[PDB]
Amino acid sequence: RTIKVFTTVDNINLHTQVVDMSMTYGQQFGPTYLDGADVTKIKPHNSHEGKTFYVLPNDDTLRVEAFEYYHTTDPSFLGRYMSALNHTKKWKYPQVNGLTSIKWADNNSYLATALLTLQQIELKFNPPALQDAYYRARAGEAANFCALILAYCNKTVGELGDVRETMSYLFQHANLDSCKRVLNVVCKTCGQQQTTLKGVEAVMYMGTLSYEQFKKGVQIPCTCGKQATKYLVQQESPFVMMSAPPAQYELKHGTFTCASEYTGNYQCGHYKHITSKETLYCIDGALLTKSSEYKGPITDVFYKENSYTT
Amino acid sequence: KVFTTVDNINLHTQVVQFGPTYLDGADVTKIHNSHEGKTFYVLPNDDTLRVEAFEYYHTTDPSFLGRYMSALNHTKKWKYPQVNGLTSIKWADNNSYLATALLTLQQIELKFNPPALQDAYYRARAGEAANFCALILAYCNKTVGELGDVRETMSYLFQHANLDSCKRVLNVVCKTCGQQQTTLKGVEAVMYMGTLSYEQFKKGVQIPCTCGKQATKYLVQQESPFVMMSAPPAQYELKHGTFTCASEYTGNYQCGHYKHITSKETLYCIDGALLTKSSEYKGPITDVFYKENSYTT
Amino acid sequence: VRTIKVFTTVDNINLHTQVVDMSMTYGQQFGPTYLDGADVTKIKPHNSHEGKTFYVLPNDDTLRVEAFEYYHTTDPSFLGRYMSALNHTKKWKYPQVNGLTSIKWADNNSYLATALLTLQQIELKFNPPALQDAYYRARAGEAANFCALILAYCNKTVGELGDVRETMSYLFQHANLDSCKRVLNVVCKTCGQQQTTLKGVEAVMYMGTLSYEQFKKGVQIPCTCGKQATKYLVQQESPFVMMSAPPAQYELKHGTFTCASEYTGNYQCGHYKHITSKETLYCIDGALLTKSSEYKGPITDVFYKENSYTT
Amino acid sequence: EVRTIKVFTTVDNINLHTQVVDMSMTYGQQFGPTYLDGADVTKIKPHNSHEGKTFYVLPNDDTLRVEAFEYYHTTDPSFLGRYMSALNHTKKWKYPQVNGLTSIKWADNNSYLATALLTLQQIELKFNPPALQDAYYRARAGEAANFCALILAYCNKTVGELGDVRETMSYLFQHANLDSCKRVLNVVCKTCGQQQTTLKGVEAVMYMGTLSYEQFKKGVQIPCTCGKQATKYLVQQESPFVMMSAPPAQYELKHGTFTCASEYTGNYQCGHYKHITSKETLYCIDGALLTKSSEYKGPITDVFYKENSYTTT
Ligand SMILES: [Zn+2]
Ligand SMILES: [Zn+2]
Ligand SMILES: [Zn+2]
Ligand SMILES: [Zn+2]
């Protein structure tokens, strides 16, 4: 009339619980998952004796362990993650030019480029769930990782994704604490003026794709209206991410690590991944083609960095 | 010496002018010697061509053939693999909605009225479905690449099928205002919006009444070869052998993707060119189609 | 147990006395019930309703007959759809324009005004008494009954796309066109000459050309062989002809025609205007009136006077 | 031998850029697609009067792209094109005032734009893109033609194309500042159990499935994956208005009980929206026409209610 079972939010803590066998797991735990399967409407069939189930964080020690694993506190995180996972484990993640990609499915082009970029920049995620899923994605098993990205960005399977917005969300969960970007500008009405940026904001700029153009200054307007020049004074980070609204722009081999291109219906668009290895490579989900140069609508280009002073 | 047509049945003899002109969905307007005795399409710019066009497509819109050819330029480059015995469409240009419709039409008994459609459908059933798809786009006023709604698409297409043998009778009761029995015919006899479950439609569903109370609507009589039930996408469970086929939609109104579920020996999910078999299927369903001949409560 | 006597009707001619419990709504007792076009199904009777007449739907074998002989439709849904249409058409304006009753634009109704304006310009007689009555009332500036009836007969709802050509065919089926006959000949070089005879609606509508003289001089059409045949009018016995074709730029010359209909705008949710030839050309566009020496436009249907003709 | 004027080009019409035009080359060749007050001038020879006039041009360089990302909050390269094409038609529309609001006399199947436009003057809304916000003020003042063109292009709809009020409010609401809006819902199934979900932003102000906000407070039936009918209700709602939509159905509006609603006559292909607002009594605004009524019965499809902060009992 009862069965012994375990419930967890992070798959490591496993609190014991005694289940009625006359009630549904849902009646007892709220929404409940057995190996990704939604068993909320189900009554114990023995079998589960000894098994472990995923629950949403109902009590206060569950919310703690969940925050410590996912570094979020949204009650609806475990469930949006499983909603998306029901579809992501059905995708197929082939290796492409050494890297783990995703074949087209459910308008995921922006996820495949996002994931191919993450494997070329050196980045380590604080939240234990992310880093574990990120290592498994590197091994060809990126289903958990993709379902985590969708959940961290508040996106459902199939919605329109935006690479810059997707990476902005993830980079806040990445260990970018030690990244410094220092910017100075010439007379507005102030001659010189100096600012400093830290963390996620240090490695991200909207407005121009050319890292060198950014090094050598960009003329942006100033408080009175005089077109001053912003220039990269110093930079300390493992990479930088230059974005800009999309236009015909030319990817010159050996001048950037990787980049993303957006084509097709603007509202439900398509993304392609451009990476520079021996020659320029275009990774398109599962379709790989090589070329000496590239021209297309480029949104966001990725470059590697150690330290920079001008 | 060539042939200009609008419908491919009636050839007008020419020598070589025509206006916007097509040979196999390529815009050869702004331009040989191997084009001898080969048919060309053109836009109807005379009363004889407009009547030929009306008779063949069942449209009087001057732009139909235009948009037909425009769409066909892309759909000729789509692939149409055979999947589980049906013609489907390799994903491209956000066409999942066209694939699901296409896979549904083969599984339900339907007769199109306009010669263009019935002939294009037979080719699609044979594997050459570029014309059928391009007709659907033009009938629905959609361009390649635009996102599409399967419920919308079937409504447009059913407008062009013989469904006047299909009769549906419904009963509604509110506690204050009594009963109202209504007879629906044609397209409204096969399409219902509000719920996915056919059995629940027979047993009553709660809908609002101007009264203010919730009334309850149920199916009294039904004469048709199939029915189609729709509702906003929502997690829903499909059980082998209780339905004919169904559509799943991931995402939202701006950008999403359809897949197709069919019930054979086991549940098969067709996702364009890919097929995965399944003992059960749950996901966000939006349309379910059921076999029918004659039901009376 | 308060009660009153009231009348229930399907046609507002044959009235049936009923006694109604006042503790029960009209809906419980009759089904859908109306009082001068207003849904009163949810309400219980008042003292004041007393010998008033109420509209119901056909809910017994005897009522289904009165509806048939009055509307010439067996379709059970017909009276309910007419009432729903009437909720909005009673709200439409029916101003006079140039001796004719028209309809101020509303609810994508441009096709109904062209249809109505045409009907007051051609001799025609409807069989269904309901239609005939609504028509007379239409001429008198009270066309709401008529519009609701056309909608019902054409299975369209308020605001939907209408089609002047579909609309008129529907109606003509409800007109006495038995004294109308047309004869045509098709001569193909390969196949020969065959004559067919047309009786009824088929006799007064052609779908190939807006030009009635052309139909007399012959028009080219497909032939079962493959060659363009030529079909021409040998004789026409009818009060009018309606010539229709897919819309094209086309010139309406003064005095050569009774009236036409123009179709513009988004083809999927389009606009119609009415062209009628009097002392000058008059383009009636709902409430607005224009007057011109000539007219070029995308004409969709042309109406012509006719009594008898032999080529 | 040579002739030139000085025009301004812009993307936002705030950052004017001084340009000398070779009066031997159409604005097109010099600038690319160029517009004057929504009129395409790509391939028209310049004029001598065209001096000092502000010209709109496509963003064809990094600086303008960013001037235009800050202004329209969209990076779609066709935005200006679609905005100007709409604009050239919406400047020809009439903007009569009905009942103190800016409406639109009917043309080009614009009824859905008028209802939306009337609705946006009665609900507390703030837009994030300066372009919508800037046009919004002008629209209230009585000059709404620029606003209407922006709506058209933010929604990817063209003049004359049939529109859907609910679809358009959704698009526009994504550009509203709605992060201080929060909705807590609770679903209860006899079999499957209890689950509470929270919504923010647009998802907190729009609900589809019922017209009545009071039912939503009291409980609406919806299918559950178990197969039973579950019950959902408003635990906690916090926003200045709420929006309730249902597929159009005969339904009664009652004075004082709401802010405004939309009536729809037609089907999925051709249709007409009307507007209803609750002031001293009910007012049906049909573009230009105004007609009064004590109570309103018709095919309602969207209802708007005012809100402050509501927590269930
Ligand atoms: Zn200054
Ligand atoms: Zn009721
Ligand atoms: Zn022949
Ligand atoms: Zn349940």
What's the domain range around A250? Answer: 180-310
Give the number of domains in chain C.
Answer: 3
Last residue of a domain, one of B166, B190, B220: B166
Cα–Cα nearest to C261, from C250, C251, C275: C275
d(CA A1, CA B177): 50
Q: Which residue of B has its CA nearest to D298?
A: B210
Chain C contact present for D162, CB below 8 A:
yes
Q: Which secondary structure element, helix H or strand E, spans residue B193, and what is its range?
A: strand B191-193
Cα–Cα nearest to B168, from B191, B147, B150, B146: B191
Instruction: Characterize the bridge pairing of strands A270-276 and A280-284.
Output: antiparallel
d(CA B159, CA B142): 16
Q: Phi and psi of A5, rounded to 5°?
A: -145, 160
Q: What is the dihedral of CA B94, D248, B185, C245, to 10 degrees?
A: -70
Q: Whose structure tokens read 């498994």?
A: A136
Residues D167 and D71 in one domain: yes
Structure tokens at C190: 């390969």
Query: What per-residue string of b and e applies to A75-87 under the rule 16 or more CB within 10 Å gives b?
Result: bbbbbbbbbbbbb
Chain B contact present for D167, CB below 8 A:
yes
Residue D250's beta-bridge partner residues?
A: D299
d(CA B224, CA A70): 53
From the CA of C32, the nearest ligand is: 2
Q: Whose structure tokens read 């300066």?
A: D130
Structure tokens at D225: 């994956």
Is residue B143 a contact partner of residue B134, using CB atoms and an 8 Å limit?
A: no
Burial class (CB in 10 A: 0-12, 13-18, 19+), C296: exposed
Contacts of D140 (CB under 8 A, 6+ apart): D102, D121
Chain B contact present for D268, CB below 8 A:
yes
The CA-based diameter of chain A, rounded to the nearest angstrom, is 80
Instruction: Characterize the bridge pairing of strands A3-8 and A52-55.
Output: parallel
Q: Which secondary structure element, helix H or strand E, spans residue D18, and what is its range?
A: strand D17-22
d(CA B242, CA B281): 12
Cα–Cα nearest to D185, from D238, D124, D257, D229: D238
Structure tokens at A17: 């619980």
Q: Whose structure tokens read 């400093």?
A: A196
Is residue A106 a contact partner of residue B233, using CB atoms and an 8 Å limit?
A: no
d(CA A274, CA B266): 41
d(CA B141, CA D278): 37
Instruction: Characterize the bridge pairing of strands C259-264 and C295-305.
Output: antiparallel
Residues A151 and A275 in one domain: no
d(CA C78, CA C86): 12
Cα–Cα nearest to C221, from D45, B48, B240: B48
Residue C253 CA: distances (Å) to CA of C165, C248, C258: 21, 15, 11
Strand segments, DSSP code E, in chain C are 3-9, 16-21, 34-35, 38-39, 53-55, 96-97, 100-101, 181-188, 192-199, 205-207, 219-222, 228-237, 240-252, 259-264, 271-277, 281-285, 288-292, 295-305, 308-310
Counting one residue from B and one from D, how many pairs have CB atoms under 8 Å apart?
A: 36
CA D240 to chain centre: 17
Long-range contacts at C188-197 (CB < 8 A, ≥ 24 apart)? C188/C223, C188/C225, C188/C227, C188/C229, C188/C230, C189/C227, C190/C223, C190/C225, C190/C227, C191/C223, C191/C224, C191/C225, C191/C229, C195/C234
Residues A160 and A191 in one domain: no
Q: Which chains touch C (3 or more CB pairs under 8 A)?
A: B, D
Chain B contact present for D44, CB below 8 A:
no
Chain D contact present for C108, CB below 8 A:
yes
Centre of ligand 4 to C-alpha B286, Å, is 19
The resolution in angstroms reads 2.5
Q: Which residue of D has its CA nearest to A55?
A: D195
Discontinuities after residues in chain C (C–N over 2.5 A) = none
Residue D119 CA: distances (Å) to CA of B64, C257, D124, D166, D276: 36, 47, 10, 11, 9
Contacts of B48 (CB under 8 A, 6+ apart): C219, C220, C221, C228
Structure tokens at C128: 């269904």
d(CA B209, CA B217): 11
Sheet (strand A32-34) strand order:
A15-19, A3-8, A52-55, A32-34, A37-38
Residues A260 and A175 in one domain: no
Cα–Cα nearest to D85, from D157, D27, D32: D157
Residues D163 and D190 in one domain: no
Residues C223 and C310 in one domain: yes
Residue type, A211: Y
Residues A26 and A50 in one domain: yes
Discontinuities after residues in chain B (C–N over 2.5 A) = 16, 31
Residues of D in contact with B255 (CB under 8 A): none
Residues A115 and A190 in one domain: no
Q: How far apart are the first and last CA of chain D?
A: 83
H-state helical runs in B127-192 = 130-139, 150-158, 187-190
**Residue A234 to chain D, least CA–CA distance (Å):** 23
H-state helical runs in chain A = 25-29, 60-70, 77-88, 109-118, 128-138, 143-152, 163-172, 211-215
User: What letter would DSSP give residue C202?
Assistant: G
Secondary structure (3-state) at A74 = coil
Long-range contacts at D48-52 (CB < 8 A, ≥ 24 apart)? D48/D3, D48/D5, D48/D23, D50/D5, D50/D7, D50/D21, D51/D5, D51/D6, D51/D7, D52/D5, D52/D6, D52/D7, D52/D8
Secondary structure (3-state) at C63 = helix
Cα–Cα nearest to A206, from A104, A77, A301, A80: A301
Residues D159 and D253 in one domain: no
Residue D220 CA: distances (Å) to CA of A262, D227, D229, D300: 42, 16, 10, 18
Residues C99 and C176 in one domain: yes
Chain D contact present for B197, CB below 8 A:
yes
Number of alpha carbons in the 13 Å side-chain half-sphere of residue C214: 14
Query: Can you say whether the dihedral through the CA atoms of D50, D55, D59, D61 is positive or negative?
Result: positive
d(CA C78, CA C67): 9
Last residue of a domain, one of C125, C158, C180: C180
Centre of ligand 3 to C-alpha C183, Å, is 19
User: What letter would DSSP give residue C275?
Assistant: E
Number of alpha carbons in the 13 Å side-chain half-sphere of residue D39: 8
Residue C280 CA: distances (Å) to CA of B19, C25, C300: 36, 57, 20
Residues A243 and A205 in one domain: yes
Disruptive mutation site among B64, B176, B188, B211 for chain C (greatest number of C CBs within 10 Å)? B176
Last residue of a domain, one of D154, D181, D208: D181
Number of alpha carbons in the 13 Å side-chain half-sphere of residue D157: 23
Centre of ligand 2 to C-alpha B210, Å, is 6
Residues A261 and A192 in one domain: yes
Q: Measure the CA angle with vertex A28, ends A26 and A31; round to 5°.
A: 30
Is residue D169 a contact partner of residue D116, using CB atoms and an 8 Å limit?
A: yes
Query: Which experimental approach was used here?
Result: X-ray
Structure tokens at B238: 């499909």
Q: Phi and psi of C221, rounded to 5°?
A: -145, 160
Chain B contact present for A107, CB below 8 A:
yes
Centre of ligand 1 to C-alpha C126, Å, is 83
Centre of ligand 2 to C-alpha D108, Å, is 37
